[PDB]
Amino acid sequence: SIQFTDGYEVKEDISVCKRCIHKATNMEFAVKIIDKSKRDPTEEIEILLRYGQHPNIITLKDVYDDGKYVYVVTELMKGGELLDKILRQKFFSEREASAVLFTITKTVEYLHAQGVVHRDLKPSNILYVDESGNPESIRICDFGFAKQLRAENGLLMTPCNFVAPEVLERQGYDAACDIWSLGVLLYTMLTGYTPFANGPDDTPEEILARIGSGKFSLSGGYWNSVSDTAKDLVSKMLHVDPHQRLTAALVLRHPWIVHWDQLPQYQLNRQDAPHLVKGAMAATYSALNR
Ligand SMILES: COC(=O)CCC(=O)OC
Ligand SMILES: COC(=O)CCC(=O)OC
Ligand code: NA
């Protein structure tokens, strides 16, 4: 009945994502406009409906379906990408890096336990809702690739009936891939450069050759100022073998997360090239998805 046009005014582009105005309040929101002939966003909407009330998951405000497009209205992120803000802070410290990773990983731990893998958890999908710089303002966004574990009969399941074994191991693989991207995030927060790519021009083959070799530098340079506890966690999040990589639950038990209050609060020594990083990250995830 009531359409999206009726309660909202559409504004500039930000699937297609636009800014909009709720007419009764003049508050502003984001709407993701989804072409039903391209893809079925039932999964994405079910996940946002069930789980968007989490303080650190993007919150769903309104949904409409006109038969062509689905309109998914959410809070509008006004604080930009997390990594963009953090890489431009000269005085950022491991203690702040740990508070950020804690907030994010606690959210991922909750999702995985509810049977949800994100599958697109790159840094540019992790944003700040406002400019406060507070970890509470973090939001994980874009669940367009996420998946709920289900049984054969359609019944929502949690990893703790009958689910096909290859649905389970694939879910396991997907959850590990989620943690690996949080590893990429951590590495980059600590040093100002990404682990597998130097810039947007790195070839996909060389990025994948680095990923597949399971090796990345944890010593020297920007890493001289960084604690062993941090390096240890990074190494266990980026481990190339998903069977050996930490889970979200184990990340939260690492002393770098638990003992944050013993972490150095002096400034990290980092590359300052946030725009280079952005292109290196895009190159890294392009190589991955192919
Ligand atoms: C309402 O959803 C959007 O505005 C799409 C963009 C996005 O979520 O990027 C992280
Ligand atoms: C299929 O993609 C993934 O498994 C992402 C994580 C990963 O590449 O670890 C090496
Ligand atoms: Na939320």
Name the structure determination technique: X-ray
Q: Are 149 and 115 in contact (CB under 8 A)?
A: yes
The answer to whether 15 is annotated as binding is: yes
Task: Copy the structure tokens of residue 43.
Answer: 């999964």
Task: Copy the structure tokens of residue 132.
Answer: 């406060």
Residues in the chain: 290
Which run of H or of E encompasses 19?
A: strand 16-22
Q: Are 179 and 246 in contact (CB under 8 A)?
A: yes
Q: Are 265 and 95 in contact (CB under 8 A)?
A: yes
Alpha-carbon torsion 86, 91, 97, 100, what sign? negative
Task: Copy the structure tokens of residue 57.
Answer: 């998951």
CA nearest 237: which of 28, 97, 48, 32?
97
CB count within 10 Å of CB 151 equals 13
Ligand 2, pocket-test mutation among 120, 180, 196, 290, most atoms within 8 A of CB: 180
Q: How far is CA 66 from the centre of its chain?
A: 30
- 37: Cβ–Cβ under 8 A, 6 or more apart, which residues? 68
Q: Give the separation between CA 232 and CA 264, rounded to whole angstroms.
A: 15
Q: Give the separation between CA 74 and CA 138, rounded to whole angstroms.
A: 14
Angle ∠(95,241,164) on CA atoms, nearest 5: 110
The answer to whether 177 is annotated as binding is: no
Beta bridge partners of 9: 21
Give the burial class of 124: count Cβ atoms within 10 A of its Cβ; 0-12 exposed, 13-18 middle, 19 or more buried.
middle
Q: How far is CA 283 from the centre of its chain?
A: 16
Catalytic residues: 120
The answer to whether 122 is annotated as binding is: no
Q: What is the DSSP string of 129-154?
A: SSSS--GGGEEE---TT-EE-B-TTS
Q: Give the separation between CA 241 and CA 231, rounded to whole angstroms.
A: 17
Ligand 1, pocket-test mutation among 142, 143, 181, most atoms within 8 A of CB: 142
* Domains, the chain, ordered by start: 1-39+59-76 (3.30.200.20), 40-58+77-290 (1.10.510.10)
- 241: Cβ–Cβ under 8 A, 6 or more apart, which residues? 214
- Answer whether 14 contacts ligand 1 (Cβ < 6 A): yes
Among the bound ligands, name the one nearest to the CA of residue 74. Answer: 1
Q: Are 202 and 285 in contact (CB under 8 A)?
A: no
Smallest CA separation from ligand 2 atom 7, residue: 177
Residue 286 phi/psi, 5-degree rounding, is -60, -45
Q: Give the separation between CA 15 and CA 143, rounded to whole angstroms.
A: 12
Q: Are 185 and 103 in contact (CB under 8 A)?
A: no
- Strands of 137-270, DSSP E: 138-140, 147-148
Q: Are 33 and 16 in contact (CB under 8 A)?
A: yes
The residue written with tokens 């990025």 in the block is: 207
Bridge pairing between strands 60-65 and 28-35: unpaired
CB count within 10 Å of CB 102 equals 17
The residue written with tokens 């002096």 in the block is: 266
CB count within 10 Å of CB 247 equals 17
Resolution of the experimental model, in Å, one decimal: 1.9
Which run of H or of E encompasses 191?
A: helix 165-191
Task: Copy the structure tokens of residue 69.
Answer: 């497009």
- 157: Cβ–Cβ under 8 A, 6 or more apart, which residues? 115, 149, 150, 151, 163
